[PDB]
Design a protein around this ligand. Structure first.
Ligand SMILES: [Mg+2]
Ligand SMILES: [Mg+2]
Ligand SMILES: [Mg+2]
Ligand SMILES: [Mg+2]
Ligand SMILES: [Zn+2]
Ligand SMILES: [Zn+2]
Lengths: 146, 94, 39, 99, 97, 38, 160, 87, 177
């Protein structure tokens, strides 16, 4: 990659990189996910792929550099946010309640003091409508709202 | 005689003594009592399955609320199996 | 399993026109067949 | 009046109790109740819920054998659905036809 | 190498089908508890060993809370019942097997 | 701030930011343009 | 060299349930023959005791054993103390083995013997209908006939 | 009377020991706990300082009584209502 | 079985002391399986008048996990019946106050609403941390499997599966990152 060092003398240097794994099963794909046959087959747990697609301090990388299509990029950014909130990325930190599948930022959301009637209930969101189209492997679909 | 149990009809006192006498006279090593299964133990309703073993081979098992009564019941089960009065024995032919 | 029974052709209720519901319940111990059942 | 309507409710409640006990035994063998019932009727054993609960309580080995037969029928069904061709139908997926 | 269920808790179950395919034969011998899986069995100079017979009389509240702690119930099981229920109770119930 | 349902940029210096679960129009040079989505 | 169809090991690239391979049919039929022959020689020698059966009788399924009692809710056109053979045997079983019919076992394979020992009536059952504010009130008493059968013996023959 | 005082571990004193008035010092601040003077069963006027009703101007047998205790929609009286009792 | 009648009855109707772990488990799944075990619905000899419940010992209830934003969304509501007794605390506040209240309330909700619920809740035992009293520890039988799978954060993947997972994209050589 490329790094800058400060000593006033600052310098940009080139370090080693990892390249593409040799033989993708679908060479005709247009995004890396499409090339590796992972379109609906990943979740927020897959921190190997997520850490492959993030910055070292937890931020996301741009679509153009990653080569991702827009839909896959938005699914990656939501999965990265949920994994960060669940605490599955302890080394990609900036600069106690256990959670998972946290859609919204925990410090931005107001409590449901008045749940509705059972025809207009105020439901509690779990997971992501971006990941709604994942493969189900069950006879009941994902319940996005609890 | 149909619906009754062997030690319901023939009362005995020391099933362990009868069992060790039977095993001695049919040339079997003396049985060892071991705690196969246990639930509770400190509460007022314990459950003990004690197994009687001979040459590291199970011959009987018995439940009880205490260890001693579980061992006695295991001795009675051993006597039943050795004598042919088991619950699943062949019924009488009429 | 009514749909599976319909696929196999064995009605939907197991109590319909099968051997289980149409064979005689009992017979005499010497072998004489029972009189036919009302149903 | 309560006696008569309770005849109706007694039949319903007894079937509910049988289903509860069969579900308990099936979960004790790692199986689910719909899988057990559907696979037994696919294997053409027409034991009802009353004698199934009776076997669950008093004959645990016979119930374990029934659960194993049902699970084996489930695996045959999954294998046939996965194969989707004209493979052999399976040993216990065979249907005894009557005429 | 295939078993429909694990074969180590109740019986070694083997399913079979007869040659005509008309009946299913099950063979299930019981499993026995291993010896190694078991556990070994648990184990004044001048006067009498006088028998230690103290029976402290607890009043109703402490007695019921002690019984509730012992048997993991509530207090309502231990509180008494009236003469109406006591005489309604059947003292010669039917008995099957 | 002014509570609005539709937020409209009134300057070239206004900007939409989503903070605490709500959209906001912040303007540094014209502070009367501060709008809060409701 | 990755196959055209390879997926990397993610959380849900593969099914949650473990892969199950079924045994080959030829070896399985030989194993079935061995197990059936083993159970048949147990039946021949007599290494069993206290058989039970699940018997279809009077639209119900009864789990009977020897020296048993059942109560049939209708008359059976038989004299008392009369020995009959129950035939629709859904299941027979012992300790260490059971036999399963599809759905009925062979009459050559298994016999159930029963004896009519009582022909009686039930206790009186009340049917009362009441609809309120409509003067609707109706009472009836029924006594269903009943037949008590004693299951004598359950016999199996070596025919597997 | 025995009273229980919460202390830290460095202030433990041996049981059976005498305590006197110079345990405190002048210019200090203390809290004093006691059972108050008991007035028996008292009405709302002495117990809760209710204003009560006028004496003359037509009033029938109401001068020291509580008025409404609740509203009509509530089919009950709220817990913690100020009503006569031991004061 | 050839047991005598009283030992056979005792063996059938005896109680079992099941063990269950919290530690990033969802309290609703914990409460579902604990409720089944407390009612005795896992037994084929079950009947509602047979008092066939079992003891359930749940530990590490301080380390439960809510899916989604339930820590801030979910509100527990109670009312001390004095005018103004209406209190509403979030799940976070209730967990910070009492480490066992959430799991206790979930199990109390899923138990049947009859007179047996309090007896079942007395047979329930909850502990916030790894510590269990010694008598309960000598009573315990069968730690039950956890419902969740503990999704295994990035730093405890070993190098074998890390380099077994293939690399999806090649980055430009001049990107700072
Ligand atoms: Mg129905
Ligand atoms: Mg005045
Ligand atoms: Mg007047
Ligand atoms: Mg006056
Ligand atoms: Zn794509
Ligand atoms: Zn502006």
């Amino acid at each position: 990659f490329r790094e800058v060092v400060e000593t006033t003398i600052i310098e940009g240097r080139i370090t080693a990189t990892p390249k593409e794994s040799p033989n993708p099963p679908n060479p005709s794909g247009q995004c890396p996910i499409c090339r590796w046959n992972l379109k609906h087959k990943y979740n927020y747990d897959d921190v190997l792929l997520l850490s492959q697609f993030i910055r070292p301090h937890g931020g996301m990388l741009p679509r153009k550099i990653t080569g991702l299509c827009q839909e896959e990029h938005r699914k990656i950014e939501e999965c990265v946010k949920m994994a960060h909130r669940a605490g599955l990325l302890p080394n990609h930190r900036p600069r106690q309640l256990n959670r998972y599948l946290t859609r919204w930022a925990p410090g931005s959301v107001k409590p449901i003091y008045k749940k509705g009637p059972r025809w207009n209930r105020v439901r509690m969101p779990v997971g992501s409508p971006l990941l709604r189209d994942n493969v189900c492997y069950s006879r009941t679909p994902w319940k996005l709202y609890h | 005689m149909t619906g009754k149990e062997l030690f319901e009809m023939w009362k005995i006192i020391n099933p362990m003594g009868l069992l060790v006498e039977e095993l001695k006279k049919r040339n079997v090593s003396a049985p060892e009592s071991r705690l196969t299964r246990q639930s509770g133990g400190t509460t007022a309703l314990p459950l003990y399955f004690v197994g009687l073993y001979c040459d590291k081979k199970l011959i009987a098992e018995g439940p009880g609320e205490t260890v001693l009564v579980a061992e006695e019941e295991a001795a009675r089960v051993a006597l039943r199996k050795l004598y042919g009065f088991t619950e699943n024995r062949r019924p009488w032919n009429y | 399993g009514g749909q599976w029974r319909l696929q196999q052709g064995l009605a939907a209720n197991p109590s319909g026109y099968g051997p289980l519901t149409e064979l005689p319940d009992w017979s005499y111990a010497d072998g004489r067949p029972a009189p036919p059942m009302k149903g | 009046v309560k006696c008569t309507k309770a005849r109706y409710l007694k039949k319903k409640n007894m079937r509910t109790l049988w289903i509860n006990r069969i579900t308990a035994a099936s979960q004790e063998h790692g199986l689910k109740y719909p899988a057990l019932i559907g696979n037994l009727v696919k294997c053409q054993v027409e034991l009802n819920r009353k004698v199934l609960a009776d076997l669950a309580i008093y004959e645990p080995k016979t119930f374990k054998s029934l659960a194993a037969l049902a699970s084996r029928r489930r695996h045959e069904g999954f294998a046939a659905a996965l194969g989707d061709g004209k493979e052999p139908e399976g040993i216990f997926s065979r249907v005894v036809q009557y005429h | 190498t295939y078993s429909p269920l694990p074969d180590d808790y109740n019986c070694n179950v083997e399913l079979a089908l007869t040659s005509d395919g008309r009946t299913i034969v099950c063979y299930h011998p019981s499993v026995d508890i291993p010896y190694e899986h078991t556990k070994p069995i648990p184990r004044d100079q001048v006067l009498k060993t006088r028998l230690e017979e103290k029976v402290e009389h607890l009043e109703e509240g402490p007695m019921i809370e002690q019984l509730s702690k012992m048997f993991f119930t509530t207090k309502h099981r231990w509180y008494p019942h009236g003469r109406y229920h006591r005489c309604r109770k059947n003292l010669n119930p039917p008995k099957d097997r | 701030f002014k509570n609005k349902t539709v937020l409209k940029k009134r300057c070239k210096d206004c900007y939409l930011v989503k903070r605490r679960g709500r959209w906001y129009v912040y303007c540094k040079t014209h502070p009367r343009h501060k709008q809060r989505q409701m | 060299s990755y196959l055209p169809g390879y997926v990397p090991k993610t959380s849900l690239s593969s099914p949650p349930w473990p892969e199950v391979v079924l045994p080959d049919p030829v070896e399985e039929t030989r194993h079935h023959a061995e197990v059936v022959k083993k159970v048949n020689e147990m039946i021949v020698t007599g290494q069993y005791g206290r058989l039970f059966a699940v018997v279809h009788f009077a639209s119900r399924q009864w789990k009977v054993t020897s020296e048993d009692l059942i109560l049939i809710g209708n008359e059976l056109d038989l004299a008392c103390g009369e020995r009959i053979r129950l035939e629709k045997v859904l299941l027979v079983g012992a300790d260490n083995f059971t036999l399963l019919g599809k759905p009925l076992l062979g009459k050559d394979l298994v016999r159930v013997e029963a004896t009519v020992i009582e022909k009686t009536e039930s206790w009186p059952r009340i049917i009362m209908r009441f609809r309120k504010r409509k003067n609707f009130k109706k009472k009836r008493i029924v006594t269903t006939p009943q037949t008590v059968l004693r299951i004598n013996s359950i016999e199996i023959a070596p025919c597997l | 009377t025995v009273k229980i005082f919460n202390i830290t571990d460095n202030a433990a004193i041996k049981p059976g020991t005498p305590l006197y008035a110079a345990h405190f010092r002048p210019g200090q601040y203390v809290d004093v706990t006691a059972k108050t003077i008991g007035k028996g069963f008292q009405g709302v006027m002495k117990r809760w300082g209710f204003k009560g009703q006028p004496a003359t101007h037509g009033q029938t047998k109401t001068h020291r009584r509580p008025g409404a205790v609740a509203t009509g929609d509530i089919g009950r009286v709220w817990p913690g209502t100020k009503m006569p009792g031991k004061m | 079985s050839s047991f005598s009648r009283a030992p056979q009855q005792w063996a059938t109707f005896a109680r079992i002391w099941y063990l269950l772990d919290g530690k990033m488990q969802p309290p609703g799944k914990l409460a579902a399986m604990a409720s089944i075990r407390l009612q005795g619905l896992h037994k084929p000899v079950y009947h509602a008048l047979s008092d066939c419940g079992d003891h359930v010992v749940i530990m590490n209830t301080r380390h439960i996990a809510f899916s989604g934003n339930k820590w801030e969304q979910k509100v527990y509501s109670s009312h001390t019946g004095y005018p103004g007794g209406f209190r509403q605390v979030t799940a976070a506040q209730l967990h910070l106050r009492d480490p066992v209240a959430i799991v206790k309330l979930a199990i109390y909700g899923m138990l049947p609403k009859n007179l047996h619920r309090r007896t079942m809740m007395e047979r329930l035992h909850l502990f916030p941390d790894e510590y269990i009293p010694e008598d309960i520890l000598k009573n315990l039988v069968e730690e039950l499997p956890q419902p969740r799978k503990i999704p295994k954060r990035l730093d405890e993947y070993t190098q074998e599966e890390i380099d077994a997972f293939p690399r999806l994209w090649t980055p430009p050589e001049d990107y700072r990152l």
